[PDB]
Design an enzyme around this catalytic site. Structure first.
Site, PDB file in Angstrom:
ATOM      1  N   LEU A  22       0.831  -1.198   0.014  1.00 45.13           N
ATOM      2  CA  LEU A  22      -0.063  -0.246  -0.025  1.00 45.13           C
ATOM      3  C   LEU A  22       0.917   1.287  -0.025  1.00 45.13           C
ATOM      4  O   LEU A  22       1.919   1.064   0.512  1.00 45.13           O
ATOM      5  CB  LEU A  22      -0.900   0.119   1.332  1.00 45.13           C
ATOM      6  CG  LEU A  22      -2.156  -0.636   1.448  1.00 45.13           C
ATOM      7  CD1 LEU A  22      -2.601  -1.846   0.176  1.00 45.13           C
ATOM      8  CD2 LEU A  22      -2.441  -1.536   2.468  1.00 45.13           C
ATOM      9  N   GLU A  30      -8.806   1.109   9.311  1.00 44.46           N
ATOM     10  CA  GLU A  30      -8.779   1.074   7.893  1.00 44.46           C
ATOM     11  C   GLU A  30      -9.003  -0.272   7.658  1.00 44.46           C
ATOM     12  O   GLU A  30     -10.055  -0.735   6.951  1.00 44.46           O
ATOM     13  CB  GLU A  30      -8.177   2.007   7.077  1.00 44.46           C
ATOM     14  CG  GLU A  30      -8.689   2.621   5.909  1.00 44.46           C
ATOM     15  CD  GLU A  30      -9.162   1.685   4.771  1.00 44.46           C
ATOM     16  OE1 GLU A  30     -10.444   1.243   4.214  1.00 44.46           O
ATOM     17  OE2 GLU A  30      -8.265   0.485   4.541  1.00 44.46           O
TER      18      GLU A  30
HETATM   19  N1  LIG Z   1      -5.211   0.586  -1.551  1.00 41.09           N
HETATM   20  C1  LIG Z   1      -6.152  -0.486  -1.612  1.00 41.09           C
HETATM   21  O1  LIG Z   1      -7.166  -0.428  -1.822  1.00 41.09           O
HETATM   22  C2  LIG Z   1      -5.576  -1.656  -2.552  1.00 41.09           C
HETATM   23  C3  LIG Z   1      -6.768  -2.634  -2.932  1.00 41.09           C
HETATM   24  C4  LIG Z   1      -5.999  -3.716  -3.905  1.00 41.09           C
HETATM   25  C5  LIG Z   1      -4.659  -3.874  -4.111  1.00 41.09           C
HETATM   26  N2  LIG Z   1      -3.945  -2.746  -3.657  1.00 41.09           N
HETATM   27  C6  LIG Z   1      -2.427  -2.666  -3.964  1.00 41.09           C
HETATM   28  O2  LIG Z   1      -2.562  -2.543  -5.696  1.00 41.09           O
HETATM   29  C7  LIG Z   1      -1.740  -3.591  -6.317  1.00 41.09           C
HETATM   30  C8  LIG Z   1      -2.250  -4.603  -7.033  1.00 41.09           C
HETATM   31  O3  LIG Z   1      -2.666  -4.026  -8.228  1.00 41.09           O
HETATM   32  P1  LIG Z   1      -2.531  -4.536  -9.653  1.00 41.09           P
HETATM   33  O4  LIG Z   1      -3.637  -3.718 -10.481  1.00 41.09           O
HETATM   34  O5  LIG Z   1      -1.440  -4.487 -10.258  1.00 41.09           O
HETATM   35  O6  LIG Z   1      -2.990  -6.034  -9.699  1.00 41.09           O
HETATM   36  P2  LIG Z   1      -4.289  -6.945  -9.740  1.00 41.09           P
HETATM   37  O7  LIG Z   1      -5.439  -6.308 -10.494  1.00 41.09           O
HETATM   38  O8  LIG Z   1      -4.418  -7.635  -8.292  1.00 41.09           O
HETATM   39  O9  LIG Z   1      -3.446  -8.145 -10.372  1.00 41.09           O
HETATM   40  C9  LIG Z   1      -3.282  -8.036 -11.968  1.00 41.09           C
HETATM   41  C10 LIG Z   1      -3.182  -9.719 -12.315  1.00 41.09           C
HETATM   42  O10 LIG Z   1      -4.315 -10.138 -12.094  1.00 41.09           O
HETATM   43  C11 LIG Z   1      -4.941 -10.804 -13.073  1.00 41.09           C
HETATM   44  N3  LIG Z   1      -6.226 -10.115 -13.515  1.00 41.09           N
HETATM   45  C12 LIG Z   1      -6.648  -8.901 -13.299  1.00 41.09           C
HETATM   46  N4  LIG Z   1      -7.750  -8.659 -13.737  1.00 41.09           N
HETATM   47  C13 LIG Z   1      -8.155  -9.789 -14.390  1.00 41.09           C
HETATM   48  C14 LIG Z   1      -9.257  -9.939 -15.269  1.00 41.09           C
HETATM   49  N5  LIG Z   1     -10.378  -9.227 -15.613  1.00 41.09           N
HETATM   50  N6  LIG Z   1      -9.443 -11.250 -15.847  1.00 41.09           N
HETATM   51  C15 LIG Z   1      -8.214 -11.932 -15.518  1.00 41.09           C
HETATM   52  N7  LIG Z   1      -7.355 -11.804 -15.000  1.00 41.09           N
HETATM   53  C16 LIG Z   1      -7.127 -10.646 -14.351  1.00 41.09           C
HETATM   54  C17 LIG Z   1      -3.899 -10.988 -14.354  1.00 41.09           C
HETATM   55  O11 LIG Z   1      -3.421 -12.122 -13.811  1.00 41.09           O
HETATM   56  P3  LIG Z   1      -2.709 -12.887 -15.138  1.00 41.09           P
HETATM   57  O12 LIG Z   1      -1.380 -12.309 -15.674  1.00 41.09           O
HETATM   58  O13 LIG Z   1      -1.874 -14.190 -14.273  1.00 41.09           O
HETATM   59  O14 LIG Z   1      -3.425 -13.348 -16.235  1.00 41.09           O
HETATM   60  C18 LIG Z   1      -3.196  -9.697 -13.927  1.00 41.09           C
HETATM   61  O15 LIG Z   1      -1.611  -9.743 -14.378  1.00 41.09           O
HETATM   62  C19 LIG Z   1      -0.715  -3.851  -5.126  1.00 41.09           C
HETATM   63  O16 LIG Z   1       0.173  -2.856  -4.995  1.00 41.09           O
HETATM   64  C20 LIG Z   1      -1.291  -4.084  -4.045  1.00 41.09           C
HETATM   65  O17 LIG Z   1      -0.616  -3.974  -3.064  1.00 41.09           O
HETATM   66  C21 LIG Z   1      -4.441  -1.569  -2.929  1.00 41.09           C
HETATM   67  N1  LIG Z   2     -10.841   0.115   1.765  1.00 39.53           N
HETATM   68  C1  LIG Z   2     -10.012  -1.052   1.632  1.00 39.53           C
HETATM   69  N2  LIG Z   2      -9.829  -1.447   0.389  1.00 39.53           N
HETATM   70  C2  LIG Z   2      -9.427  -2.762   0.248  1.00 39.53           C
HETATM   71  N3  LIG Z   2      -9.600  -3.453  -1.004  1.00 39.53           N
HETATM   72  C3  LIG Z   2      -8.384  -2.812   0.761  1.00 39.53           C
HETATM   73  C4  LIG Z   2      -7.301  -4.165   0.715  1.00 39.53           C
HETATM   74  C5  LIG Z   2      -6.548  -4.552   1.671  1.00 39.53           C
HETATM   75  C6  LIG Z   2      -5.585  -5.657   1.091  1.00 39.53           C
HETATM   76  N4  LIG Z   2      -4.423  -5.789   1.920  1.00 39.53           N
HETATM   77  C7  LIG Z   2      -4.289  -6.268   3.346  1.00 39.53           C
HETATM   78  C8  LIG Z   2      -2.691  -5.922   3.636  1.00 39.53           C
HETATM   79  C9  LIG Z   2      -2.148  -5.448   2.399  1.00 39.53           C
HETATM   80  C10 LIG Z   2      -0.945  -5.127   2.057  1.00 39.53           C
HETATM   81  C11 LIG Z   2      -0.586  -4.784   0.566  1.00 39.53           C
HETATM   82  C12 LIG Z   2      -1.526  -4.987  -0.190  1.00 39.53           C
HETATM   83  C13 LIG Z   2      -2.919  -4.968   0.188  1.00 39.53           C
HETATM   84  C14 LIG Z   2      -2.985  -5.351   1.247  1.00 39.53           C
HETATM   85  C15 LIG Z   2      -6.001  -3.492   2.676  1.00 39.53           C
HETATM   86  C16 LIG Z   2      -6.873  -2.400   2.908  1.00 39.53           C
HETATM   87  C17 LIG Z   2      -8.059  -2.236   2.011  1.00 39.53           C
HETATM   88  N5  LIG Z   2      -8.917  -1.464   2.275  1.00 39.53           N
END
Ligand SMILES: NC(=O)c1ccc[n+]([C@@H]2O[C@H](COP(=O)([O-])OP(=O)(O)OC[C@H]3O[C@@H](n4cnc5c(N)ncnc54)[C@H](OP(=O)(O)O)[C@@H]3O)[C@@H](O)[C@H]2O)c1
Ligand SMILES: N[C@H]1N[C@@H](N)[C@@H]2C[C@@H](CN3CC[C@H]4CCCCC43)CC[C@@H]2N1
Length: 186
Positions: A22, A30
């Site tokens: 994150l 959160e």
């Molecule tokens: N702040 C927040 O709320 C929050 C929430 C979630 C994640 N995060 C962060 O955001 C980042 C992950 O993000 P991201 O966008 O890179 O990854 P993601 O969407 O989790 O992973 C993308 C992979 O997922 C698969 N995929 C995604 N959409 C797909 C679909 N519609 N159909 C099939 N496969 C699909 C594909 O896998 P294949 O390549 O294997 O086909 C693609 O390479 C990380 O940094 C995580 O820490 C933050």
């Molecule tokens: N409101 C909200 N929306 C989400 N979808 C969230 C995804 C959660 C997934 N987690 C738990 C610990 C994590 C570490 C690194 C990347 C993602 C991680 C984190 C908090 C979220 N809050």
């Protein structure tokens, strides 16, 4: 299946992740809210479905995977089977939803929450019909490498309030944040 919802924590600059994690220091309350929202089912004996892309699954600390009390579906066109700890693997978001309809997941699942990442959100978001976005607004800029897609306010309405969701500005580790609920029906 019940309601289709998206949940995300976003920075001021629309950031959601940085190098598989994150953009901000961990906010325990959160995380507690995310747990509570996604886990609580509106119907007894049913459970919620959590859908995430592959990178999201691998960014969750191992001690925390799978997300307990929820059906964990991972999306990927490259995996041959679900990763260790995951319950289902789908190759696209429609198959993930088509599966909710198999007498198997049928009536076990009340709600399905998209928990990330970018590509999954972008797609759910353009999906037709009724959808709610639970957005935690992180009120500062955080260097990010992954972004949340633009919310089209001609389609999504910010709700004035919602049951179980605090309307007051929260603060933790000196970071201010707020919880918002958006709704669409198209
Ligand atoms: N702040 C927040 O709320 C929050 C929430 C979630 C994640 N995060 C962060 O955001 C980042 C992950 O993000 P991201 O966008 O890179 O990854 P993601 O969407 O989790 O992973 C993308 C992979 O997922 C698969 N995929 C995604 N959409 C797909 C679909 N519609 N159909 C099939 N496969 C699909 C594909 O896998 P294949 O390549 O294997 O086909 C693609 O390479 C990380 O940094 C995580 O820490 C933050
Ligand atoms: N409101 C909200 N929306 C989400 N979808 C969230 C995804 C959660 C997934 N987690 C738990 C610990 C994590 C570490 C690194 C990347 C993602 C991680 C984190 C908090 C979220 N809050």
């Amino acid at each position: 299946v019940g309601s289709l919802n998206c949940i995300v924590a976003v920075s001021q600059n629309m950031g959601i992740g940085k190098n598989g994690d994150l953009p901000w220091p961990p906010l325990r309350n959160e995380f507690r809210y995310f747990q509570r929202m996604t886990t609580t089912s509106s119907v007894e004996g049913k459970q919620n479905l959590v859908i995430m892309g592959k990178k999201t699954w691998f960014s969750i600390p191992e001690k925390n995977r799978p997300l307990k009390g929820r059906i964990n579906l991972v999306l990927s066109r490259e995996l041959k089977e679900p990763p260790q700890g995951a319950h289902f693997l789908s190759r696209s978001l429609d198959d993930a939803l088509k599966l909710t309809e198999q007498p198997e997941l049928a009536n076990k699942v009340d709600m399905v929450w998209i928990v990330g990442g970018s590509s999954v959100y972008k797609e759910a978001m353009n999906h037709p019909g009724h959808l709610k976005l639970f957005v935690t607004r992180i009120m500062q800029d955080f260097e990010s490498d992954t972004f949340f897609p633009e919310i089209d306010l001609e389609k999504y309405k910010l709700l004035p309030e919602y049951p179980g969701v605090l309307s007051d500005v929260q603060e933790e580790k000196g970071i201010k944040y707020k919880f918002e609920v958006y709704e669409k029906n198209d």
